[PDB]
Amino acid sequence: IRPTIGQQMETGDQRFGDLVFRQLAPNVWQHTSYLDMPGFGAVASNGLIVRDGGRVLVVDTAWTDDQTAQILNWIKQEINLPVALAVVTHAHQDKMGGMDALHAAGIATYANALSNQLAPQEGMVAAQHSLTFAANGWVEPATAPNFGPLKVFYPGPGHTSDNITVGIDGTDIAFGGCLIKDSKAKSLGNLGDADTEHYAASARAFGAAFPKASMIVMSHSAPDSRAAITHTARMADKL
Numbered sequence: 001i002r003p004t005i006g007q008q009m010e011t012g013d014q015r016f017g018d019l020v021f022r023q024l025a026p027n028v029w030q031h032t033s034y035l036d037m038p039g040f041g042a043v044a045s046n047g048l049i050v051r052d053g054g055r056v057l058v059v060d061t062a063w064t065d066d067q068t069a070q071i072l073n074w075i076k077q078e079i080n081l082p083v084a085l086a087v088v089t090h091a092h093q094d095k096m097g098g099m100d101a102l103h104a105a106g107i108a109t110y111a112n113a114l115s116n117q118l119a120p121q122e123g124m125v126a127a128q129h130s131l132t133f134a135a136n137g138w139v140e141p142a143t144a145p146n147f148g149p150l151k152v153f154y155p156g157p158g159h160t161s162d163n164i165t166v167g168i169d170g171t172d173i174a175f176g177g178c179l180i181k182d183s184k185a186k187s188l189g190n191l192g193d194a195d196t197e198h199y200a201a202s203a204r205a206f207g208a209a210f211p212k213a214s215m216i217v218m219s220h221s222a223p224d225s226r227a228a229i230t231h232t233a234r235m236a237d238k239l
């Protein structure tokens with residue numbers, strides 16, 4: 001009995017080690033990893049895995065190197081294709097905590113230049129390559145070679161000064177990272193590094209960058225429809 005990963009994922013989300021995986025589209029999966037906070041519930045963070053022909057692309061690490069190695073084990077077991085590159089979406093632990101695991105696997109890594117400047121100070125590891133964005137927010141294509149379906153956009157400062165977002169061409173999916181929370185969220189999470197003045201505008205900019213994306217994928221909520229974007233901007237309005 002040798003079903004494909006797609007066939008297996010019809011049963012629903014799949015636990016793998018300490019992670020959870022969910023198929024969002026035929027070649028796109030959401031990875032979820034958890035930070036234990038002693039005496040409280042474990043904090044979930046989501047990223048993406050994209051099968052792009054004969055290679056795999058990753059958006060965001062897990063919280064730690066070990067959890068990120070678990071992601072790479074899942075990819076080997078279920079997809080059995082090489083991981084070419086990763087884009088990581090700001091200098092917080094949930095997004096860049098596992099860079100050492102990616103680098104040791106021979107994966108080429110990319111982050112906002114600002115994320116690469118901030119990370120080492122914070123005890124994290126910079127990505128190998130720096131993305132630069134035009135004033136309009138779109139990544140300068142020269143800094144994002146061979147990204148396949150990934151379309152990288154800097155929406156402005158919000159959740160953090162460096163936060164970036166990723167559309168997946170050929171699908172209904174855009175990844176807001178930690179900028180966007182779902183349409184039922186009571187909180188924007190920890191705003192300690194947030195630009196509270198510009199947050200709402202940056203959430204709006206994300207929605208306007210990916211107008212055809214009907215599935216919004218987020219770090220700290222399950223996937224939602226586009227109402228997540230204006231809900232988040234409403235929660236961020238005049239903080």
Ligand SMILES: [O-]
Pocket residue numbers: 092093094178
């Ligand atoms: O975060």
Ligand SMILES: [Zn+2]
Pocket residue numbers: 090092159160178
């Ligand atoms: Zn963050």
Ligand SMILES: [Zn+2]
Pocket residue numbers: 045092094095178219220
């Ligand atoms: Zn986050």
